[PDB]
Amino acid sequence: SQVEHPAGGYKKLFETVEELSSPLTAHVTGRIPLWLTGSLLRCGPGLFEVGSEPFYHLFDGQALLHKFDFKEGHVTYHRRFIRTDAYVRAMTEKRIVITEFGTCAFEVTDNALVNIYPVGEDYYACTETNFITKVNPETLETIKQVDLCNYVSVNGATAHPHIENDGTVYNIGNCFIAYNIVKIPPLQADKEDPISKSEIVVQFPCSDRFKPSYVHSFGLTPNYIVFVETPVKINLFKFLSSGANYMDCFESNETMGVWLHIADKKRKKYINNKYRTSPFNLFHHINTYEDHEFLIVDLCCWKGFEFVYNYLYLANLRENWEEVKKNARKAPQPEVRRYVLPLNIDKADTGKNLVTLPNTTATAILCSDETIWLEPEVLFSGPRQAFEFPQINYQKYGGKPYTYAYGLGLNHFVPDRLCKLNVKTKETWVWQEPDSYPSEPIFVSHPDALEEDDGVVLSVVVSPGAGQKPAYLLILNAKDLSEVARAEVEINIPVTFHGLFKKS
Amino acid sequence: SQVEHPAGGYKKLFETVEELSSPLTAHVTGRIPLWLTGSLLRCGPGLFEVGSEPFYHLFDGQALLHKFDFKEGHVTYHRRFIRTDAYVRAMTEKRIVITEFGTCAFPGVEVTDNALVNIYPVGEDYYACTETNFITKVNPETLETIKQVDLCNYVSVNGATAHPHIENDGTVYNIGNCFIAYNIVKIPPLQADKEDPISKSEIVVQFPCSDRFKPSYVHSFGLTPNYIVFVETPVKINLFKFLGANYMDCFESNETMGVWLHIADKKRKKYINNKYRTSPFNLFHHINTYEDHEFLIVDLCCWKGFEFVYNYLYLANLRENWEEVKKNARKAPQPEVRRYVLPLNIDKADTGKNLVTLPNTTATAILCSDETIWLEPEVLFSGPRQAFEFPQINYQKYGGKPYTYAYGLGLNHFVPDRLCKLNVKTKETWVWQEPDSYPSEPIFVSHPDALEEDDGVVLSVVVSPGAGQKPAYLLILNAKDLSEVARAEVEINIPVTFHGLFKKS
Numbered sequence A: 001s002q003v004e005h006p007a008g009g010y011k012k013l014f015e016t017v018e019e020l021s022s023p024l025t026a027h028v029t030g031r032i033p034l035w036l037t038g039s040l041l042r043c044g045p046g047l048f049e050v051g052s053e054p055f056y057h058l059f060d061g062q063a064l065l066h067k068f069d070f071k072e073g074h075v076t077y078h079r080r081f082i083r084t085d086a087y088v089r090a091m092t093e094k095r096i097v098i099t100e101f102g103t104c105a106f107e108v109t110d111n112a113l114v115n116i117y118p119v120g121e122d123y124y125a126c127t128e129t130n131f132i133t134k135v136n137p138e139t140l141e142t143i144k145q146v147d148l149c150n151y152v153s154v155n156g157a158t159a160h161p162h163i164e165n166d167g168t169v170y171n172i173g174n175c176f177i178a179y180n181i182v183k184i185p186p187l188q189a190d191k192e193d194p195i196s197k198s199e200i201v202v203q204f205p206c207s208d209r210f211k212p213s214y215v216h217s218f219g220l221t222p223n224y225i226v227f228v229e230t231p232v233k234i235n236l237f238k239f240l241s242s243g244a245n246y247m248d249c250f251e252s253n254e255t256m257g258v259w260l261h262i263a264d265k266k267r268k269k270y271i272n273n274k275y276r277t278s279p280f281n282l283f284h285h286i287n288t289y290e291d292h293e294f295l296i297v298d299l300c301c302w303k304g305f306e307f308v309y310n311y312l313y314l315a316n317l318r319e320n321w322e323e324v325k326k327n328a329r330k331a332p333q334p335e336v337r338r339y340v341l342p343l344n345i346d347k348a349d350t351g352k353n354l355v356t357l358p359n360t361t362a363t364a365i366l367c368s369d370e371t372i373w374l375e376p377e378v379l380f381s382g383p384r385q386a387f388e389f390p391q392i393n394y395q396k397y398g399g400k401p402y403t404y405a406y407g408l409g410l411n412h413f414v415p416d417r418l419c420k421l422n423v424k425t426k427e428t429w430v431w432q433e434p435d436s437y438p439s440e441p442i443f444v445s446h447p448d449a450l451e452e453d454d455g456v457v458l459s460v461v462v463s464p465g466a467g468q469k470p471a472y473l474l475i476l477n478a479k480d481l482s483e484v485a486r487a488e489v490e491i492n493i494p495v496t497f498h499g500l501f502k503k504s
Numbered sequence B: 001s002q003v004e005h006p007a008g009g010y011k012k013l014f015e016t017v018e019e020l021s022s023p024l025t026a027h028v029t030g031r032i033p034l035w036l037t038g039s040l041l042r043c044g045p046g047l048f049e050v051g052s053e054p055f056y057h058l059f060d061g062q063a064l065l066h067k068f069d070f071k072e073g074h075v076t077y078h079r080r081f082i083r084t085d086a087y088v089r090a091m092t093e094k095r096i097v098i099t100e101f102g103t104c105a106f107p108g109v110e111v112t113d114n115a116l117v118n119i120y121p122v123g124e125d126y127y128a129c130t131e132t133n134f135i136t137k138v139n140p141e142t143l144e145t146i147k148q149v150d151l152c153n154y155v156s157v158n159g160a161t162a163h164p165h166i167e168n169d170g171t172v173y174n175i176g177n178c179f180i181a182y183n184i185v186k187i188p189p190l191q192a193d194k195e196d197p198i199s200k201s202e203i204v205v206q207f208p209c210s211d212r213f214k215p216s217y218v219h220s221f222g223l224t225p226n227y228i229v230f231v232e233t234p235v236k237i238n239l240f241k242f243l244g245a246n247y248m249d250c251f252e253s254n255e256t257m258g259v260w261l262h263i264a265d266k267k268r269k270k271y272i273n274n275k276y277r278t279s280p281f282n283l284f285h286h287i288n289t290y291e292d293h294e295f296l297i298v299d300l301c302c303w304k305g306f307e308f309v310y311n312y313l314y315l316a317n318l319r320e321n322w323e324e325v326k327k328n329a330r331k332a333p334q335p336e337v338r339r340y341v342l343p344l345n346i347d348k349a350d351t352g353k354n355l356v357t358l359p360n361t362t363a364t365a366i367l368c369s370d371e372t373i374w375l376e377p378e379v380l381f382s383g384p385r386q387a388f389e390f391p392q393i394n395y396q397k398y399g400g401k402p403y404t405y406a407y408g409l410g411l412n413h414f415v416p417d418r419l420c421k422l423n424v425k426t427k428e429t430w431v432w433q434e435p436d437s438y439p440s441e442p443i444f445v446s447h448p449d450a451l452e453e454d455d456g457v458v459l460s461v462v463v464s465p466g467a468g469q470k471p472a473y474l475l476i477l478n479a480k481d482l483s484e485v486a487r488a489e490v491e492i493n494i495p496v497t498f499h500g501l502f503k504k505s
């Protein structure tokens, strides 16, 4: 069960690195599948201080774009800092110029350290503000800054847009109060920038006139949009003034629990079903789908209302292992949960469980005040052991009935294993090596697969044990997480959050 | 996975039987352990109508006391109706005389003493019980009825549960509604003076009620060496109605309270004012409770929702055909085994945070600014309409203490159809099941030379009405892995039984 990290190697995840001038050849062990052709692109912090001025929070370091290229069984690695306003102005002024998530500078940040996604024929790196950064997926050059506020009424947008098979992009953002769903169309014949055709399609109400919830991701199915309103609130009174940073504006609402919300995607209409449950933080939706008259909502939850980001200051993450474990003792507990939301609410069933599906223990109780109280079916739960950074076979099973999810396992917040979960049987598979700290696993299907898990997962692994290559790209068979290959590099790679595989 | 019962054999669980004049010899297959010497005593309903007048609810049929005797590898079976007021008066008047849980009798208030639920020791005596103020002294050897005892003659309660805890010295603890609070009753071991320990009954501590005028239904409670745990659910008894109605008619569900959990210091006899709160569930059976550093570990068989589960347990529903049984259970609360963890040391400096600092659990307890402590469980077992119920452990040695194993009856849309074992630390399970076979609660008996917690057997009474077979049997499974050790078959039907005990001789 309990794996230990006394050597403290995970500190290398949070150590500054230098960008490269051109790609390095990675040394391959095992055999890279010959059908694997394209680029794994991932974003993370890469510079954790400017001179003698430190960044304090996990989400503050300057965005670094990484690329592993796969061709004919060979692999290269490359990385470049993203030339954001934050980064450029810091390099020019030799200090911290723009305030970051948890570091006040002594102007909204555009430090796009979180994810990269396609819009039309373009790729954008992002954080969670109004600024996204167009980047070149081949050379990793920075192209331009885009301000979503030039196009739509939001104050920010998540780093987790959903992307439909035709290239339509959906996202959600706070609007200072409601939450707006933005839709960006596929590239059209006119060839003009799809972002100039952005529109707000539906709006979700807020539980508190003046305190919107923090929102990190959302759910999408062919017919519905799902939004989970958590008790982690942004105190706008503090937000809109001023020595404050973003972290300083968050607070937890102790009494509201979680409110869940659905909208009809095609009719562009909020549905006034008052789904309610107990408090949790939520970062990542796993998948969402329709099953008879119900939505199945699979979530990576953190049990409690205290904001989990409070545990993610770099000083805490760089502590020695005994201290890391002790610091996490009172944190919210991670748990994968399936919630089931009834769409057809009959008053005649007031007082009863509406979840009549045969295959779940999730419940939904219709109350006399018309709230629908939910209880989850727990899919995975281990003590301070999170199944996080979830990924699925997204292109073919996103928004649809599915069986398999892949995740990064966090041990008291330290990433130390890769996991696969069968969401129907609760069976799990694990890949782990001592002193090895992987990243979010990304699934790539065999191009001719008919099965759900016929493919590989890719993860970037830091391995700072002194007799070893410092980092490598790991390739696992998706069926059972057995190792297929590694591509080793001779330089460190810091933590990365999210990314994508771009087939070529 | 989903096992089906199209033949409808479970209906035999709810079919009247005749008592026996003396014990029958049961036919043994396999090997009865030679160290197993004593009597399995169990209670259930055995007469489900009086003439043409039907009883309507699972908890209404007249109490039948069953006994399987084990000696030198041989087994006998015997049963006798308990001669309660309810039964005797019904036999005399040839009608339903006393109102039962879910059956109004038609012509002060005569409370039922139909002791169909359990049997337990007090001093050197054995009492059959239901959940009212009346318990019935019975002879564990002949199954004769000795006396009715009215607990109200001795202590201030309106009823007491069928699940008293019994300490190793014979001290009995129980809880009961007092019309409003909940009282813990303590009955001492038999003393030198030899007088009836019930005459020395006392109330040792009282739990407050969430609603001035509506006490919760209480079925069981938790006990450790130092604490008593009481779970106040949203299933309420509407006293306005209570004081053509039956008991079922007086229940209602409180939609907004959720579950309140309560602790008392057992040795100092005082209520602890920690406001533990969580989401709504029905609870019948505590599994086990224990102390772990500054926390209580509270393992429960829960039913997710506030609707009263007993609504699903009318005989007309339980006797339906299988497709209808499944359909009827679709909107019922879902069963789930949950571990709750209750912090005993509440520091204000931790307001807003999770107080459960133990290394081995995902249960949480959040201290709020209003001083409520909001709990979330660690789920130990969960299957769709598949309950791990009627839990039993190695009670004599692990009751109230750190433990690893529980045994249960598995309910499939309320139909008992399998026996289960759960490792509460690893969540591993083991299952025994045969087609068209409907078991009872499994009771654990330790091997005399046991080294480990699960060195022993479980005993269960199984109905097997498949037409090419003996109609019922006593099943013995090895507790290590639930593999079958023996059966003792009888040629007569045995209806459903709820609870019981093994009395070593």
Ligand SMILES: NCC[C@@H](O)c1cccc(OCC2CCCCC2)c1
Binding pocket: A059, A100, A101, A109, A114, A127, A128, A129, A130, A155, A156, A157, A159, A174, A234, A246
């Ligand atoms: N992925 C973790 C958080 C990070 O993306 C981040 C870094 C910096 C600012 C920020 O702001 C989030 C707020 C943007 C405006 C609307 C409210 C949320 C969020």
Ligand SMILES: NCC[C@@H](O)c1cccc(OCC2CCCCC2)c1
Binding pocket: B059, B100, B101, B112, B117, B130, B131, B132, B133, B158, B159, B160, B162, B177, B237, B247
């Ligand atoms: N085990 C299922 C319920 C059954 O024992 C039963 C049968 C008949 C009456 C009754 O009453 C419960 C109430 C008694 C008075 C105090 C409140 C509970 C309970």
Ligand SMILES: CCCCCCCCCCCCCCCC(=O)O
Binding pocket: A058, A114, A159, A283, A308, A312, A388, A410, A413, A414, A415, A439, A440, A495, A496, A497, A498
């Ligand atoms: C690979 C990260 C390891 C260190 C931090 C792990 C703690 C993660 C807590 C839950 C997810 C937080 C959100 C990060 C992803 C994102 O920014 O989009």
Ligand SMILES: CCCCCCCCCCCCCCCC(=O)O
Binding pocket: B058, B117, B162, B284, B309, B313, B389, B390, B411, B414, B415, B416, B440, B441, B496, B497, B498, B499
């Ligand atoms: C062996 C019982 C089979 C038929 C009834 C099964 C439904 C049980 C529901 C949960 C337990 C309810 C309480 C019964 C125990 C008791 O009366 O002491």
Ligand SMILES: [Fe+2]
Binding pocket: A159, A160, A216, A283, A284, A497, A498
């Ligand atoms: Fe994320």
Ligand SMILES: [Fe+2]
Binding pocket: B162, B163, B219, B284, B285, B498, B499
């Ligand atoms: Fe019971």
